[PDB]
Symmetry: C3
Subunit: 123 residues, 3 copies
């Protein structure tokens, strides 16, 4: 009178949820890659912004043998506020990412055992 057939569905449902959760983890990494990759583009953009500051007034003088160059910063470089927080942001993802992988490894081991134990009841 045991409802093993129902348990087989429940145990299987956990496996499907586990697969999606695992997929979310891989997908989550991609989101981090795009967000983080954009930051690399931003650093490249900051350089170009600075190059402009170099452009100020060239040839702006026909009676003087001099050129005035005023490289006033143009890129707001983030050294402490965002860089320090960004490192924390990436670090945190690492700790949670590692936590998730650890839990997934346990879930996979445990998910298999629940299915293995079920087979024994009706092997």
């Amino acid at each position: 009178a045991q409802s093993r057939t129902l348990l087989a569905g429940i145990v299987q449902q956990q496996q499907q949820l586990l697969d999606v959760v695992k997929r979310q983890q891989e997908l989550l990494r991609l989101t981090v890659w795009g967000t983080k990759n954009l930051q690399t583009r931003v650093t490249a953009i900051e350089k170009y912004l600075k190059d402009q500051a170099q452009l100020n007034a060239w040839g702006a003088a026909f009676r003087q043998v001099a050129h005035t160059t005023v490289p006033w910063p143009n890129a707001s470089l983030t050294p402490k506020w965002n860089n320090e927080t960004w490192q924390e942001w990436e670090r945190k993802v690492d700790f949670l990412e590692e936590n998730i992988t650890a839990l997934l490894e346990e879930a996979q081991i445990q998910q298999e055992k629940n299915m293995y134990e079920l087979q024994k009841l009706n092997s």
Copy 2:
């Protein structure tokens, strides 16, 4: 003849899935923080872009006592299309984020009860 030992594994597996799902929620917030933080950097960059437009032709005149300044916009400011949609994007995350927290609270309460009920069967 009840398979409580199997249920203990199944109930535990749900707890581990719940922990990972919860972790995804915290991790999801970090992804939103980095994406959103980049937008703040973009707003800072837009300002610098505008400063350039101010730079056009300085000292480009040695027989005139005047300076020509042409601040042609350089930053594409998003006032309606992206700003309005971005607010919706952030809002939507808020509604889904709140929905997830509400469901997690129920899941935690319910997860505990399922384990508590299991103890009673074999307390």
Copy 3:
């Protein structure tokens, strides 16, 4: 002596986990939208960066009837390294996104059946 009441809680817990997982999927898409949307802003910014390069030295000449224009690139355009990888990044999300939707459809069908089967035991 069957613990159906416990199963009803376990089966329900899976439904709540499924709802949150599904919510994560919708939320995950928003994160991709913001990250990807920023890239569209970056492409707009690259154009403006180039416009600057056009600005070099105007009117920098009062004894010549000529203007020197030096449009030195200012935007680092990503044609192959990031564009090709970015397409892969978006593609991968598509494959995982489709995988998740497929699994969710099966989970919903299966989740319903587990609940439907439970009703039969005590309908």
